CSV table of C-alpha atoms (C1' of nucleotides) in Angstrom, one decimal:
chain,number,residue,atom,x,y,z
A,140,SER,CA,207.5,-26.7,-64.3
A,141,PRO,CA,205.8,-23.6,-65.8
A,142,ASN,CA,203.8,-21.3,-63.5
A,143,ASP,CA,206.9,-20.9,-61.2
A,144,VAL,CA,208.9,-18.1,-59.7
A,145,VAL,CA,212.7,-18.0,-59.8
A,146,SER,CA,215.1,-15.3,-58.7
A,147,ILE,CA,218.7,-14.6,-57.5
A,148,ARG,CA,219.7,-15.1,-53.9
A,149,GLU,CA,218.6,-12.4,-51.4
A,150,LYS,CA,222.2,-11.2,-50.7
A,151,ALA,CA,223.4,-10.6,-54.3
A,152,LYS,CA,220.8,-8.2,-55.9
A,153,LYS,CA,223.1,-5.1,-55.5
A,154,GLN,CA,225.9,-6.6,-57.6
A,155,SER,CA,227.3,-5.1,-60.8
A,156,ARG,CA,226.6,-8.5,-62.5
A,157,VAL,CA,223.0,-8.7,-61.5
A,158,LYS,CA,222.1,-5.0,-62.1
A,159,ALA,CA,223.9,-5.1,-65.5
A,160,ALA,CA,222.3,-8.4,-66.6
A,161,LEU,CA,218.8,-7.3,-65.5
A,162,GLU,CA,219.1,-3.9,-67.3
A,163,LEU,CA,220.3,-5.9,-70.3
A,164,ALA,CA,217.2,-8.1,-70.2
A,165,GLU,CA,215.2,-4.9,-69.9
A,166,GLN,CA,216.9,-3.7,-73.1
A,167,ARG,CA,216.2,-7.0,-75.0
A,168,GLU,CA,212.8,-8.2,-76.3
A,169,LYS,CA,210.4,-8.3,-73.4
A,170,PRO,CA,208.6,-11.6,-73.3
A,171,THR,CA,204.8,-11.6,-73.0
A,172,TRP,CA,205.1,-15.2,-71.9
A,173,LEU,CA,207.6,-14.6,-69.0
A,174,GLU,CA,206.8,-11.9,-66.5
A,175,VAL,CA,210.2,-10.5,-66.0
A,176,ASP,CA,210.5,-8.4,-62.8
A,177,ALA,CA,213.6,-6.2,-63.2
A,178,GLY,CA,212.8,-4.4,-59.9
A,179,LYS,CA,212.1,-7.7,-58.2
A,180,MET,CA,215.0,-9.1,-60.2
A,181,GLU,CA,213.2,-12.4,-61.0
A,182,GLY,CA,211.1,-14.3,-63.5
A,183,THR,CA,207.6,-15.8,-63.2
A,184,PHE,CA,206.7,-18.3,-66.0
A,185,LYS,CA,203.2,-19.5,-66.8
A,186,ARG,CA,203.3,-21.7,-69.9
A,187,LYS,CA,205.7,-22.5,-72.7
A,188,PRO,CA,205.2,-20.2,-75.7
A,189,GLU,CA,203.1,-21.8,-78.5
A,190,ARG,CA,203.7,-21.6,-82.3
A,191,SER,CA,203.1,-17.9,-82.3
A,192,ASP,CA,206.0,-16.6,-80.1
A,193,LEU,CA,209.1,-18.4,-81.4
A,194,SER,CA,211.6,-18.0,-84.2
A,195,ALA,CA,210.4,-18.1,-87.8
A,196,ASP,CA,213.7,-19.1,-89.5
A,197,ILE,CA,214.1,-22.6,-87.9
A,198,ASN,CA,213.5,-26.2,-88.7
A,199,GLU,CA,212.0,-28.9,-86.4
A,200,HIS,CA,209.7,-31.0,-88.5
A,201,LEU,CA,212.8,-31.7,-90.6
A,202,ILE,CA,214.7,-32.6,-87.4
A,203,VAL,CA,211.8,-34.8,-86.3
A,204,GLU,CA,211.9,-36.7,-89.6
A,205,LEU,CA,215.7,-37.0,-89.3
A,206,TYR,CA,215.4,-38.4,-85.8
A,207,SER,CA,212.4,-40.6,-86.7
A,208,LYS,CA,213.3,-41.9,-90.1
B,1,A,C1',184.2,66.9,-125.6
B,2,C,C1',189.4,65.2,-125.9
B,3,U,C1',195.3,60.4,-120.9
B,4,G,C1',192.1,54.7,-120.8
B,5,C,C1',190.1,48.4,-126.6
B,6,U,C1',192.1,41.4,-125.2
B,7,C,C1',199.0,40.9,-123.9
B,8,U,C1',195.1,35.0,-125.4
B,9,U,C1',194.0,28.5,-120.1
B,10,U,C1',199.6,29.6,-113.1
B,11,A,C1',205.3,28.4,-109.4
B,12,A,C1',208.6,25.7,-113.9
B,13,C,C1',215.1,20.5,-111.1
B,14,A,C1',218.9,21.3,-106.8
B,15,A,C1',220.7,17.0,-106.3
B,16,U,C1',227.4,14.2,-109.1
B,17,U,C1',232.7,10.9,-109.1
B,18,U,C1',236.0,3.8,-105.3
B,19,A,C1',232.7,1.2,-104.8
B,20,U,C1',229.2,-0.6,-100.5
B,21,C,C1',226.8,-6.3,-100.3
B,22,A,C1',225.4,-2.0,-96.2
B,23,G,C1',229.0,-2.9,-93.0
B,24,A,C1',226.2,-1.2,-71.9
B,25,U,C1',223.8,4.6,-69.2
B,26,C,C1',217.7,5.5,-67.9
B,27,U,C1',220.0,6.2,-58.9
B,28,G,C1',220.2,9.4,-54.2
B,29,U,C1',219.5,14.5,-50.4
B,30,G,C1',225.1,11.2,-45.4
B,31,U,C1',227.4,16.3,-44.4
B,32,G,C1',230.6,20.4,-43.4
B,33,G,C1',227.1,25.2,-47.4
B,34,G,C1',221.7,27.1,-47.1
B,35,U,C1',230.3,44.2,-38.0
B,36,G,C1',235.8,45.5,-38.9
B,37,G,C1',239.9,49.0,-40.6
B,38,C,C1',242.1,53.4,-39.4
B,39,G,C1',243.0,57.8,-36.7
B,40,U,C1',243.0,60.4,-32.1
B,41,G,C1',243.0,60.6,-27.0
B,42,U,C1',243.6,58.7,-22.1
B,43,G,C1',245.6,55.5,-18.7
B,44,G,C1',248.7,51.6,-17.2
B,45,C,C1',253.3,49.1,-16.8
RNA sequence: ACUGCUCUUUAACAAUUUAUCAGAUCUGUGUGGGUGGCGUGUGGC
């Protein structure tokens, strides 16, 4: 459920994998809808992004009509 | 007095030869690191 905190286990935050992947997320597009804590190595989510913050080259109404025809 | 009478609406371009569909790293202050050469002399064994 949104408004939740998730992280990696407390004994694995010095890894090459974790540091690399977190720096990678830092180098990607930073979500305003997901508070990413690259120092705390975690994510806190509040609410799913609305019509404004998603991809604009995608079809879902067509998928809805294909699944509902 | 006694060389001196319009000339006519502002700078005035270099770029150049297959060729394409563009084609992860943003760290430390753990620490070693912050007088002799020669000569001469004496004496000893």
